[PDB]
Every structure is written in C-alpha cells, then in structure tokens.
Amino acid sequence: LHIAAHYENLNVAQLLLNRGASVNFTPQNGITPLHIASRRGNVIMVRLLLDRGAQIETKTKDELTPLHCAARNGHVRISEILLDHGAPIQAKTKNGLSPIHMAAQGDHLDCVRLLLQYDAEIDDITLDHLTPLHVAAHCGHHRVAKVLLDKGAKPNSRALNGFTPLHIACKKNHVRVMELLLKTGASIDAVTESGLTPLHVASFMGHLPIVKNLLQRGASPNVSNVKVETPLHMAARAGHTEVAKYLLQNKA
Amino acid sequence: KWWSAVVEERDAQSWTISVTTPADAVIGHYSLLLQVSGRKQLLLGQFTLLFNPWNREDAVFLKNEAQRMEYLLNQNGLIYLGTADCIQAESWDFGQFEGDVIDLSLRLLSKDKQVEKWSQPVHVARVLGALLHFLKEQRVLPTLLNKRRGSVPILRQWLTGRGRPVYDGQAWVLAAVACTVLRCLGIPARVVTTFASAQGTGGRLLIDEYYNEEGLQNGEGQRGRIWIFQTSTECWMTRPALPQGYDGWQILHPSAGSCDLVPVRAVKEGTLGLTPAVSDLFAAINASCVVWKCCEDGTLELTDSNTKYVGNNISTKGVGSDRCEDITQNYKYPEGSLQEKEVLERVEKEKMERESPLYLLLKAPSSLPLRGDAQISVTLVNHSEQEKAVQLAIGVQAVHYNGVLAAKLWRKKLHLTLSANLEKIITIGLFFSNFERNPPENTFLRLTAMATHSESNLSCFAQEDIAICRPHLAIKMPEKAEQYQPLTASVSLQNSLDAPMEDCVISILGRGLIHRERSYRFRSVWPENTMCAKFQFTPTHVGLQRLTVEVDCNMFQNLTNYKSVTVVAPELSA
Amino acid sequence: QMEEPAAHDTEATATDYHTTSHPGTHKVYVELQELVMDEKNQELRWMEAARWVQLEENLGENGAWGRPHLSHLTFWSLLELRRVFTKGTVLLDLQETSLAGVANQLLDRFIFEDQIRPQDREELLRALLLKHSHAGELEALGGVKPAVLTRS
Amino acid sequence: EELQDDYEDMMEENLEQEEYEDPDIPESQMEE
C-alpha cells in the first residue's frame, strides 16, 4: 500500500484495501500511506485513503503530520483536503515547525496563502523562535515575505539570539527581502543580543549591495557592538576591502 | 505492447476484440482494415490516435491523476495578466475538446512532411509551435476589438482566415492557442505568465531605457524592452535526445521560423548550449536594466536608477483549483543567493570567453482605480554637507503590455531644497482627472521620478508599473447544483467611477451551463450606485463547470469575472 | 432581489461559435409525435403520429401504419410555418446528449428570445419530458385521444 | 534498466525516507 500510494496506483491500492490492507499501517519510521500520498502530491490517492479511514493526525518519527508533508512540497489541493478533514493547522514537529514554516521554507506562495486563509498563526515560532517571516528571510523568498507582511506578520520579531528578519536578510545577501522589510516598517537600527545592527552583519559578511542600500537609507555606520566594534571593525576583520572603502567614503 | 488484437468474448455471431497500439505509435487519423484469406481488404472504420499521459511507457506520461486532469482535460483555464504586484486572472476557454479542434490541429501538423517523427512529442510540439507562431505573425493585425472567447475561435481565424482577427494588443494569446492544440493532441500543457520579461535582447543581459529630463520616453521604444508581462507555453514530456535529467516541463520558444523546446531546468541552471534558445530565455528573466537620461543638448547621460527586477512572479493556474500557483522557483534561484551567484558568474564567464550624494526612494501603490485616486511618495535624502537645490520630475506614461509606450498622461516638476543630512518625504497625488488624456485600454502606467541637482551630472531615477483597477464584478452562485434544475446567479457591480455607466451590456457564458452566450441590457448606473442583476439558467452537464460573466459600458469594456459550480447528477429515484 | 435584465440582440460574437467542420451527408428519418391522452390512465404522453423514411406513413386509430404516400401540404401549413420560423428559436450545434438537456436549453433560449413567459417554462418542461410512447404501445395503452396542455 | 525498481535498495532510494524527517533548523552563528 505504501508503494501504491507513492506511485498513485489507484487500482492496486483499491484491491489491496479491499483485501484487508491496513490503511493506517505505521512502520518504525512512522510513515503511513497518507503521509506518502500527501508528500507526493497524489490528490486522488489522498482522497481514497481518507475515505478508507486513514488518520489525519498521525505523526512520523520527527512528528510530521500529513499536512506537514503537503505544505513542505506546496500541494495546495491536498492541504485543503486535509484541513477540511480536520488536520491540525498548528501541529508542530520536533523542532517546533508548523506547516506554514514548511510552506515558507519551500517558497510555496499559494500554500502559505491557503494556510493563512485557514487561520494559521502568522507569528508562530519554532524552538529557535523563528517566525515564518524569519524563514522567508533566511531562504530569500521575498514573495512569501510579501504575503506574510501584507497579512500582518511582525517585521521586528526576535529570534533566540535577537535576530530580526532584517538581520537574517542582511546576513544572506537577500536584498529584495531587505527592501520589502524596510518598506513595511522594519527597524534599520535594531540590535541583536550582541548589539549587532543589520549594517554590522552586512559588513561582516561583505555584502556590498546590502551595505550600500543600508547607508543610502540612513543607517549610521558608527554603531557599536557589545565590545566597542563598529561595522568598519567587522569589515577590517573579515578583509572586505570594498565594504570598508564604502564605509570610509561615508561617515565612518 | 505493440499492435495486437485478441478475441475476449465471442458468441456464434460476433467477436469482442481488444486492440492494442504501441506506446510510441504515430498519432493522427487511422483506418482499421480486416483481411480474411480468399477475400479482399474490408474497411472496418476510422479512429484517431492520440498521445497518452495515462500510460507509464508513453513519453508524455504524467505521474499524477490531478495533474493529468488539470493539464490535459480541463478546458476552463486561467491566463494571468496585469503586473507583478497586481495580477489579474482572466478566465480562458481552452476548448481543446471542441469538435473541430482535433481536425484543425492534425491538419496544421500535416504541413510537416516527416510523418515518421509524429510519434515523438518533442517533434510535434516543435513543429506546431513554429507553425502557430508563423500564423500569429501573419494574422494578428496592428491596433469589441479586444473581446475574447478562448483559443478556439482564434485558431479557426488563424487557420481559415474567417472570423474575428486578434490585434497586437493581445498577441499574448499565442501561448493559449498553443496550449489548446497541445492539450487536444494529448500533450500536457499549461500557460505560464512571466512579469517584467526582458524581450528582444538576443541573449544580452543588459537593457537600455531612455528618458528625457521630464522622466518620459520619446520614441516608441528600443528593440530590447522589459515587457510588462509575457505569456509562454509549457509542455510536459521526456527528452530522449538530451542528456539524462531533463525530463519534465519544456518551454516552447519560437524564434521569429523555427521553434525550440527548452527544459525549465536548463533556464534555471544557465545551461547555455543544451538547446539554442537557452540563452534568450535566460536573458529574459536575468537581464539588468540601465537607464539613460536624454538631455535637450543631445548628451546621453548615465543615470543612478533603482534596480528594476526582471522575471517576477512567474505564474500559472493551480492544480485542482482556481488559485494562482507561483513557479518562479523553477526558473530562478533566490536573488542574492549563492546558487544564483554561481549561475550568473558561470554565464558571464561563458559570454566573456565567447566574445551619488542624492538617493531617491519611490513608493507607489500597486494599482490605481479606474477614474480613481492614488497617493505616491518620493523620499529624497541628502548625503552632502551642503544643502542641495534639486529638480524633481514626475512622469506618468501609458505603456502596452509589450513595453511599447501608448500615451504621455501626466508630468510634474518640483523645485525643492533639502537641508544637509536630512531626509524629506514628498507626497504627490496621482489623480485620473489630472491626466492629459484617458489611458488606452489594456495599457499600464509607467510612473517615473527623476531627481537632478545642480551640476553633478548624475540624476537619481526610479520607476514603477501601476495597473489600472476596474470595479469588481461580484458573482454570487451556489457552490453545488443539481443537473436539469434551475440555478440562479446574481451579479453585483459597484460604480466607483466619477461618471455614469451608459450603454450597459452584461453577457453570460460557460461550457456545460449555457449554449454559446446570452447578452443582456441593464439600466444605467449612476456614480456610487450598485447594479444588481439575476440570471436563471439550468445546468445540463455534470461536473465542475464555470460561469463566465462579462460587462461592457461606455466607461470600460470586456470586464470579465468567473465563478465555479459543481453540477451533480440528480438523485436516484424510480 | 431587485433587477432582471432585458435581452440584448447582439451578433458581434456569433462567428466565434461557427465550427470549421464540414457536416457529413446523411439521409434523414423523420418521426412526428403529438401530445395525446390515453383511456386507461388519463395520462398525458407523446404519441407517434407519422414517419418519413422514403414516403410518408401515418399511424391510424388501430395501431397499424397506413399506406405510404407522397407528402402533400396544405396552403395554411406552409403559411404558418414560415411565420413561426421567422420568429423561431434556433439552437445550432447544441452540445446535448439527453432530451432533458435539450429541453432545458431550448426553454432557456425560449425565455431569452421572449417567445414564452418565465411562468410558462415549468409547464412546457413538464410537457416536453413526458413519456414518449410508440405505435406498439398504442394497443396496450387502451387507445389514444388527442389532448391539450393546460397550466395546472 | 526498466527493472531496477524491483530491488529493495532502489525502492528505498525512490521512497525518500529523508523527505519525511525534520532535517535541521540552521543558525550559522556569525561569531566563532
């Protein structure tokens, strides 16, 4: 039945279920046929398994529900079918990931839209206190970030180490996420627990466009860390000559 | 697995015969003949053979049943138009299972004389794409005029010369027509819209845009332009003649001619050389825009402009819904990421081997209501120690979807002084009533801002594309409906314009709901009033049907909205 | 619950529904059916009255088909036929495979052309979907008299 | 070819058990 669900072989799946196959057979890894059909985007298999009594809330070894598998691969119709059958939209994995986190991780815009329409928590946090906006900033998905910010996600959410989505976008050279966050009221001078500004992070990583845009929008280059360390200190330490040159040409 | 026949059931007077065809059979019209020894050939009948996405061994095999119905069986499609920040979904009747479409497609394919290659989906798709592009070039006229009824009447007009011709304002229908033909022949296909597409570069990653000192463009445009949107046909098949790993979605890219099938993965990874058209498709969604200021003296000065991103919000209809699916991640890596950096560097290396104190920030709404009102914000920051005397030029121009300018609408000239190291925000009202002329239909607004200061020789520039928002056509209909029973749909329209709606026509259609279409006249709607109108019709076809409503008036034309209804078979009785 | 729009005569889109397929050459069989009533149950039904294969055959009040003959027409027959065809409602290339599907689409088009009132649709739909009996059942039905449809 | 999917190792690779696990939540700490 697991193989039939993987390949969406409807006929042999119906035969197996009519000959007494367990629609809810959980192996040691916890991967039921419903998990497989939801992961593979097999809409008709998902409907068949749900009709034969597949459980909607079964967790894998890492506590993934079928909705987690559907949202991870951006299967909107499957996610809607599971939600209409009672799948918990706020179920969490071992790392505290809700399905909206999985959909944001995969740049699955329409899955994020559908989850938000079904009352998913837009500011749900993982164990590392990562919001879906944090995930979208980490992966560089500016479209997901636009959908989240337009729906009211907090642009200044703090992770465990005090990182905002702006900090994470500046770390990973995601300039579109950066402009989107700064367009929707993200603090350009927010500091982490270590006192790192977005300019600090960008100067340490050597992302020239981020540094240029941050200084053009009015970020002070003379901010200091917990140790008295300016962005010019970070640029010198990492040997980013161009970033340091643009800093020195500015008011650093 | 080849041609074969076996008798399954038999009485004394008849044989029930099961006939197979090979998974790589030549498609088209077939004659079936029976040879009995001591007897001459007898024609049993005629049948048409098609590609089979349901068969594992077929080159067009689709893994998912839902994908099979969406990409081959669904005749009710959605073509996404508008801008990247305001996407408008227009209901489109692919109509690939209309009675004459299969004959028209096979007759068009008969122009290719390599009939032995008709068993190959790649060859059939290539030939049909080239022929349909040639027909589009021959039949689409230079610029109701834009009223559309799906791909089938367009195909009929292109093939026979009879019917309503399509005009160049809707040249994007080529993708939908190609999708219809491919779906009718059994090749799974979908229409893909790419917003901000850099067309006509010839593989170059640079786009030159030219603006005068008012922030407006004089000439009709360059050869290389960033189109507001471009449609394309994607088709699903294996690629036996390519290196392993390129099975899946293929882009049909005609070249002025001949057509090429490009795997989407090749575009994403910058595999320039796998097919001849990889370079052009890659440049369409990876080019960088360079803005030039055209002075009255004749100097062509370089401009400090905002980054104009290309290849945005690559969109197609979702599987099993009327929702919009974003597939940009199939075509590009995230901006500023490591993988995008590697792909860009490799492409630059291949092409090379083969061959300021002011900062402007422009905020605009994604859409401007028709005859409506909007606010735009210009942020100017001074990085100099001296206060700056700056001339801010604001320009609004009408542009067609293919980047060709239509009409200069508005211009504004501000003269401002900023204190040293002081941000200043200038809010400007963008009003329809201020336009020197009404924008042409199916055009978009090119908003520009140009800040020039003293004699620094460099000017700050920003641009945005603004869609025109029309009043929402609200359709209220039950989600489910019983076959052969009356079903009522109510349509609401709020007149948010500054003038009455006159000569008001409402048209309803939909396959399996209404035979052809019915056009009605409703009363004139004064400003801030609401049209409410009900239509009674009986669905006669079981399944997921779609009702399409179109409203025309003196203020706007071809305003279309849709709503889906599931028609169920009547309850079993005696 | 406010407004019902009025039908607009418009042919700007009529050519978009014109098929390119040449129809086949087919011989025609014609059957004429009349709305009638039976002795046994007083139930309204459609009854075979005449058929055209090569000539015209008419069904008598015995259950037996009459002598084949050439189809003569009355002068008034062609006069009123032209009048009703001038204002007639035509559904061409109608995609229907059931009588109920045909009848519903025809009655909807009847209302759109203002040929019938919206109050007449239910009575006409009930009439068109009555039982369609044939000549063999005439003897078993206890006979047939002509009948007239009434709004009741 | 055309029969590799009949073997347990190839079927295991096709079913992709790693796609049903929570891989990691990477932080990539800036300091060292």
Q: In this structure, are B106 and B127 located in the same domain?
A: yes
Q: In this structure, are B398 and B264 located in the same domain?
A: no
Nearby residues of A136 by Cβ (< 8 Å), 6 or more positions away: A104, A142, A144, A145, A148, A165, A177
Q: How far is D2 from chain A (nearest CA, A)?
A: 15
Helix A76-84 to helix A43-51 angle, to the nearest 10 degrees? 20
Tokens of C145: 């008299």
φ and ψ at residue B420, rounded to 5 degrees: -65, 130
Method by which this entry was solved = cryo-EM
Tokens of B297: 């003296």
Q: What is the domain range of residue B563?
A: 473-568
Q: In this structure, are B517 and B446 located in the same domain?
A: no
Q: How far is A221 from chain B (nearest CA, A)?
A: 13
| β-pair partners for B91 | B78
Burial of B245 (0-12, 13-18, 19+ CB in 10 A): exposed
H/E element, B42 = strand B42-49
Q: How far is B538 from chain C (nearest CA, A)?
A: 6
3-class SS at C98? coil
Tracing tokens 């001849």 back to the chain, one arrives at B276
Q: In this structure, are B115 and B181 located in the same domain?
A: yes
On chain B, the residues whose CB falls within 8 A of the CB of A77 are: 66, 318-321
Residues 3 through 32 of chain D touching chain A, CB cutoff 8 Å? 11, 14-15, 17, 19-22, 24-31
H/E element, B45 = strand B42-49
Q: In this structure, are B190 and B307 located in the same domain?
A: yes
Per the CB < 8 A criterion, the answer to whether B384 and B357 are in contact is: yes
φ and ψ at residue A55, rounded to 5 degrees: -80, 135
On chain C, the residues whose CB falls within 8 A of the CB of B535 are: 5
φ and ψ at residue A177, rounded to 5 degrees: -60, -35
B500 vs B519: CA distance, rounded Å: 20
Contacts of C80-84 spanning 24+ positions with Cβ under 8 A: none
B494–C contact, CB cutoff 8 A? no
Of D14, D17, D30, the CB nearest to A201: D30
Q: How many CB atoms within 10 Å of residue B305?
A: 21
Q: In this structure, are B143 and B220 located in the same domain?
A: yes
Distance of CA B454 to the CA centre of its chain: 44
Q: In this structure, are B240 and B386 located in the same domain?
A: no
Tokens of B494: 């709020």
Tokens of B464: 């945005």
Q: In this structure, are B489 and B438 located in the same domain?
A: no
Interface contact flag, B521 C105, Cβ < 8 Å: no
- Chains touching B (3+ CB pairs < 8 Å): A, C
Cα R_g (chain B), whole angstroms? 28
Tracing tokens 């009710």 back to the chain, one arrives at B76
Interface contact flag, B537 C20, Cβ < 8 Å: no
B87 vs B406: CA distance, rounded Å: 21
Domain of B237: which CATH number? 3.90.260.10
Interface contact flag, C16 B535, Cβ < 8 Å: no
Beta strands in chain A (DSSP E): none
Q: Chains A, D in contact: 3+ Cβ pairs under 8 A?
A: yes
Q: How far is A8 from chain B (nearest CA, A)?
A: 7
Q: In this structure, are B556 and B445 located in the same domain?
A: no
Among left, alpha and beta (phi > 0; psi -120 to 50; other), residue B171 is alpha
Q: Count chain B–chain C contacts defined by CB atoms under 8 A.
A: 95
B384–C contact, CB cutoff 8 A? no
Per the CB < 8 A criterion, the answer to whether B319 and B238 are in contact is: no
C45 vs C132: CA distance, rounded Å: 6
| β-pair partners for C31 | C51
Tell me the DSSP string of A56-81: SS---TT---HHHHHHHTT-HHHHHH
Contacts of C137-144 spanning 24+ positions with Cβ under 8 A: C138/C47, C138/C48, C138/C59, C138/C63, C139/C63, C141/C38, C141/C39, C141/C40, C142/C38, C142/C39, C142/C40, C143/C38, C143/C39, C143/C61, C144/C36, C144/C37, C144/C38, C144/C39, C144/C47, C144/C61
Q: In this structure, are B154 and B119 located in the same domain?
A: yes
Q: How far is D27 from chain A (nearest CA, A)?
A: 9
Nearby residues of B180 by Cβ (< 8 Å), 6 or more positions away: B94, B95, B96, B101, B150, B151, B152, B155
B49 vs B444: CA distance, rounded Å: 45
CA angle C117, C121, C122 (to 5 degrees): 140
B86–C contact, CB cutoff 8 A? no
Q: How many CB atoms within 10 Å of residue B58?
A: 19
Q: In this structure, are B424 and B346 located in the same domain?
A: no
Which residue in B has a C-alpha nearest to residue A42's C-alpha? B64
B505-509 and B543-552: which strand pairing? antiparallel
Q: How many angstroms is the resolution?
A: 2.4
The residue type at B13? Q
A164 vs A145: CA distance, rounded Å: 13
Tokens of B340: 């995008």
Q: Count chain A–chain B contacts defined by CB atoms under 8 A.
A: 82
Q: Best of A142, A180, A208, A215 to disrupt the B interface by mutation (most B CBs within 10 Å)? A: A142
The single-letter DSSP state of residue B471 is: P
Q: How far is B484 from chain C (nearest CA, A)?
A: 7
Query: Of the candidates B433, B432, B395, B430, which has an alpha carbon nearest to the alpha carbon of residue B414?
Result: B395
A3–B contact, CB cutoff 8 A? no
Which residue in B has a C-alpha nearest to residue C106's C-alpha? B515
Distance of CA A112 to the CA centre of its chain: 10
B181 vs B179: CA distance, rounded Å: 6
B396 vs B217: CA distance, rounded Å: 10
Q: In this structure, are B90 and B195 located in the same domain?
A: yes
Domain of B477: which CATH number? 2.60.40.10
HEC profile for B354-418? Answer: HCCCEEEEEECCCEEECCCEEEEEEEEEECCCCCEEEEEEEEEEEECCCCCEEEEEEEEEEEEEE
Query: Of the candidates B493, B509, B508, which has an alpha carbon nearest to the alpha carbon of residue B553?
Result: B493
Cα R_g (chain A), whole angstroms? 23
- What does the longest C-alpha to C-alpha distance in chain C come to? 59
Per the CB < 8 A criterion, the answer to whether B96 and B183 are in contact is: yes
Tell me the DSSP string of B263-296: EHHHHHHT-TTSSTTHHHHHHHTT-EEEEEEE-S
